[PDB]
Amino acid sequence: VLSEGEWQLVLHVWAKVEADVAGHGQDIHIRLFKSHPETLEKHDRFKHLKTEAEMKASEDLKKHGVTELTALGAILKKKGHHEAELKPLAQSHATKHKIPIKYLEFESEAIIHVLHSRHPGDFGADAQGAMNKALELFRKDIAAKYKELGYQG
Ligand code: HEM
Ligand SMILES: [Cu+2]
């Protein structure tokens, strides 16, 4: 679990994300999609965006990133007591979108990369460690709900 201070480190960098959710969302997806192209295949509505220029030009990819980061931020503000928010996400990501738990680890990597590329002076090792811990808590909880809904993460 995370200490209150660890949560505050997480929420301080998240306050920076909220200043430009769409920009962070784009950077995270472009990183994810490039580093791990199997993630772009799972985003089948966007898999026709072959190049970074096409990715950046897509208004609907940008909206999808706001949708996902808005939901993540609500989860983080709940500081571990995110059962409410997790339940629909688990449902859809397990049974509709079919996202393996390992892809959430890919996403956590991309998030941490973007946050330190955009906010050095707010993301040193302690903050990075708190954010890592928070996303790992998230993933472990999603993993559990996957198993309860059936069929492995
Ligand atoms: C940080 C954890 C993430 C959060 C908070 C998040 C949140 C969401 C939300 C709120 C939606 C719209 C509602 C829904 O369908 O449930 C969505 C859709 C989706 N997410 Fe995620 N997501 C997460 C991670 C991922 C990852 C890691 C993948 C794939 C590598 C992914 C793939 C998808 C896809 C393919 C859709 C549907 C987009 C479409 O409408 O075309 N999600 N996600
Ligand atoms: Cu996405």
Side-chain angles (χ1 to χ4, degrees):
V1 76
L2 279 79
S3 73
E4 180 68 12
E6 285 170 345
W7 282 121
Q8 330 153 7
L9 292 175
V10 169
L11 293 174
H12 171 68
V13 308
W14 207 253
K16 309 310 222 258
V17 172
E18 296 196 316
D20 179 9
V21 183
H24 290 258
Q26 288 178 119
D27 294 353
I28 287 162
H29 274 92
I30 287 179
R31 170 67 169 207
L32 201 47
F33 288 161
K34 307 151 14 273
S35 289
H36 300 99
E38 57 273 37
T39 289
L40 175 56
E41 286 272 337
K42 289 285 181 151
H43 287 73
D44 185 38
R45 147 170 281 104
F46 300 123
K47 163 200 9 260
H48 70 281
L49 273 12
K50 257 32 136 344
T51 189
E52 276 191 21
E54 291 160 4
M55 279 172 202
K56 285 248 250 190
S58 173
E59 199 83 327
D60 174 36
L61 180 276
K62 179 166 71 189
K63 59 172 72 279
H64 165 78
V66 173
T67 298
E68 282 191 320
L69 285 67
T70 291
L72 179 55
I75 288 150
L76 297 170
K77 289 167 176 182
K78 285 146 134 243
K79 298 188 283 173
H81 207 338
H82 50 229
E83 215 198 354
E85 263 310 83
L86 251 73
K87 243 151 205 207
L89 244 5
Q91 242 155 105
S92 80
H93 283 63
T95 71
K96 295 140 82 184
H97 308 314
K98 312 305 208 307
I99 307 312
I101 292 325
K102 92 127 156 351
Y103 291 22
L104 276 38
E105 309 168 83
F106 298 157
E107 190 126 341
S108 282
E109 298 166 16
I111 292 168
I112 289 174
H113 180 266
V114 170
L115 265 48
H116 76 42
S117 285
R118 282 187 167 246
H119 308 287
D122 276 327
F123 215 42
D126 288 358
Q128 292 160 213
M131 182 68 64
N132 191 262
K133 254 188 231 70
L135 297 174
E136 126 238 87
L137 170 61
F138 164 69
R139 307 197 277 96
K140 277 218 319 255
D141 280 352
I142 285 266
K145 279 212 166 295
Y146 269 41
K147 302 204 181 202
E148 358 190 294
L149 288 170
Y151 295 146
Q152 297 338 72

